[model samples]
Target: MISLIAALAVDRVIGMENAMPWNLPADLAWFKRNTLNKPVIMGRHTWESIGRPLPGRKNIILSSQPGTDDRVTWVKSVDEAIAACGDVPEIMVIGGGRVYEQFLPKAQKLYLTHIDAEVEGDTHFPDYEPDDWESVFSEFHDADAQNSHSYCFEILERR
Candidate 1:
């Protein structure tokens, strides 16, 4: 099953451009550490945002049109992304916007780092009704703590 691992603001604003707006070193480190050697699926822009291939992981990129980059595998459909990954135990749905919407239904878990602060941005995460998913756990981190940001790490499993 697909799993999404992302960090966003209170309004679900993930980024203004291609990168995160917050100074979340701890969160970013956690992402790399956990996603290492895993399959990560993302949209074209998000793929470009990273700028380079993440070592030890297969990058699966989702786009409607043909792509020129080979740092990642480009797929025409969601199932194609999964096919590219093969039977890997977990896949990360890393994104800016559109990619998350397309994969949300197929995703079994949402690993979100919710920032305490809010910001205005062009891109946004899809908002589902609060009752939709069974919130498995929520751990709030103190500012400059192990996470280095005022955020809540939420683990949401499908209801």
Candidate 2:
């Protein structure tokens, strides 16, 4: 299954200047818990933004620069990235807007973290009708000392 993992503001903004608009530790932890053992596909910019490979998972990056190291596999296209997974049961598309847009149509599930506030951003998450997805799980997290904004973790399956 192809799944997407993202954290977006109420306005559907996911990034600004190649970084997340908010600092929410709770959301980060939630992201890690879900993606820890999965192979994650992302665009070049998303890999750059993250700076290093996320430990305990295969980092398949789509970039024109072709190379492979112990930490990451660089593929030139989305198809190449998918092929690099080599039959993983579930692949997570971790994104930076463009990658998400390209993979959204093919994804079967979504792991979304919705922040309560609207924020300015240069990049936004693609819009999907609520009727297209069925919410399978959800939990709300209040703003706390480590997390700057209130957010909800929601898991949805394509209907």
Candidate 3:
């Protein structure tokens, strides 16, 4: 199964200047917990935005630009990215908008952290049909002295 993971602000906006505008540490920690030990596929821009390969996960970058490293796999296509996964049951596609859009059709599930307030951003999450997905998990988190904003952690399975 393919799964997409992202954190977007209330307006469905995800990024500004190739980086998420919010500094929600819990959201980051949630992402780390879910993706740890899993193979993660990302587009070239997303990979570059992160500055380096994520530790504890196999970083597969979909790019025709040509490169490889001890902790990364450079794949030119989605098929190649799947092949690179080998025996993993669920490959996580961590993305910029384009990569998320490309993988959405194939994704069996989605893990989304929805922030309560809107923020300025250049990229947005694609629109989806509500009937196509069923929410299996929903948990709310409030902003406090530690966290910067209120958010909900949601898991939706394709139906």
Candidate 4:
């Protein structure tokens, strides 16, 4: 039940400093829509960037020094993070590049918001062989009054 979710700019950029470089409301909404109620696995740096557990979802933080609280499950590796989700329908591999790259091999599906603009970022999504995946779904939306840029919401599954 492993899944990955991310918003990638035209150049495959995903993060800057510790956050997204662009402000796309629609993309943020899309992330929330898909991840809510699902267990989310993220690296320790990602968790630190977010500063808190995302409300409504189980937060499984990957850290070498594992520790836990009522709201978070701390694990040492991606495999353990997936296991921490128990029998959930899907577990989301939320980002900070390295974590996403680690789970990409085991990821069953990808929920991506592909932006039509390039951005400056310190972090980028990992490259993949396009032939290894097939688009299961895609919907295009133009940038309008609310969104910052045109983007596509795509779901790709390993083929």
Top of the candidates by TM-score = 3
Q: Backbone clashes in each candidate structure, one number apiece?
A: 0, 0, 0, 0
Candidate ordering by TM-score (highest first)? 3, 2, 4, 1
Model 4 lDDT on a 0 to 1 scale: 0.88
lDDT of 4 by residue, 1-159 (tens): 788999899788988888776788888889999999999998888888888889999998888985755568889876777778999888899987999889899988999889998888888899988999999999999999988689999999999
Q: What is the C-alpha RMSD of each candidate to the true structure, in Å?
A: 1.9, 1.4, 1.1, 1.4
Compose the digit string of candidate 1's lDDT tens values, residues 30-110.
789868988888888987878887888898888899978776789989888889898878888888699888788888899
In candidate 1, where is summed lDDT lowest over 10 consecutive residues?
144-153
- Distance (Å) between predicted and true CA of 91, model 2? 0.3
State which candidate, 2 or 3, has the greater TM-score: 3
Residue 28 error, candidate 2, Å = 0.6
lDDT (CA) per prediction: 0.83, 0.90, 0.91, 0.88
Q: Whole-model lDDT for model 3 versus the true structure?
A: 0.91
Segments in model 2 whose C-alpha atoms lie over 4 Å from true places = 68-70
Candidate 2 local lDDT, 16-131, one digit each (tens): 89887678888889889999999999998998899999999999988887665657988888888899898879999999799999999999999999999888899998988789
State candidate 1's TM-score.
0.90
TM-score-best of 2 and 4: 2
